[PDB]
Design a protein around this ligand. Structure first.
Ligand SMILES: [Cl-]
Ligand SMILES: [Cl-]
Ligand SMILES: [Cl-]
Ligand SMILES: [Cl-]
Ligand SMILES: [Cl-]
Ligand SMILES: [Cl-]
Ligand SMILES: [Cl-]
Ligand SMILES: [Cl-]
Ligand SMILES: [Cl-]
Ligand SMILES: [Cl-]
Ligand code: NA
Ligand code: NA
Ligand code: NA
Ligand code: NA
Ligand code: NA
Ligand code: NA
Ligand code: NA
Ligand code: NA
Lengths: 105, 105
């Protein structure tokens, strides 16, 4: 039950972006969920600082928070958007929209 | 009160690393602390996914967790360590030990 990519389907109208995004209506953003506690998995790929903070958090749980399961690499998607003039326009690689990799940081 | 680098002084014996680290006894690791909620600061430098997840978390706080204030760039330190033979040896750039930048991810 450690840090990993799980599914997260995002509807653009729900987050108030339908005003400038015609299509798609929903996309697969994924999310990173899970713990960063010891012992770790063989593919968490954690930084030295995340390891140190996890140890410090264990010894002082009230003073220092835990490390975090976050996206460590993102992928683009394509969106059809009405530009400032108002015409549908394709953005082929809308960067940073979907999780490619998760990790403890 | 948004995501920012705050101080975190780490003692190597407290985290059980004194067995292979002779010096220094403590170092300044810093940590990233604060919220990732709207409105954001001019220097959070958040990814598109962190922005999307924050919106989804606002609309569905029980199903989707918040974005995270984590280190986005790390700096090295120097440590004196007894090697596998047992002699003090300098590691000049022990990478990923201290926070250089924080951000919402
Ligand atoms: Cl481990
Ligand atoms: Cl590292
Ligand atoms: Cl593009
Ligand atoms: Cl291409
Ligand atoms: Cl982009
Ligand atoms: Cl904002
Ligand atoms: Cl991005
Ligand atoms: Cl080095
Ligand atoms: Cl150098
Ligand atoms: Cl290193
Ligand atoms: Na949604
Ligand atoms: Na949905
Ligand atoms: Na404590
Ligand atoms: Na292509
Ligand atoms: Na400590
Ligand atoms: Na200390
Ligand atoms: Na909810
Ligand atoms: Na140098």
């Amino acid at each position: 039950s450690h840090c990993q990519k799980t599914s997260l389907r995002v509807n653009f109208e729900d987050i108030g972006w339908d005003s400038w995004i015609i299509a798609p209506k929903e996309y697969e953003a994924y999310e990173c969920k899970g713990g960063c506690f010891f012992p770790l998995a063989d593919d968490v790929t954690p930084t030295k600082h995340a390891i140190v903070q996890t140890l410090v958090h264990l010894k002082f749980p009230t003073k220092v928070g835990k490390a975090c399961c976050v996206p460590t690499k993102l992928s683009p998607i394509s969106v059809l958007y009405k530009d400032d003039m108002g015409v549908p326009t394709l953005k082929y690689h809308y960067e940073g929209m979907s999780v490619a990799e998760c990790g403890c940081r």
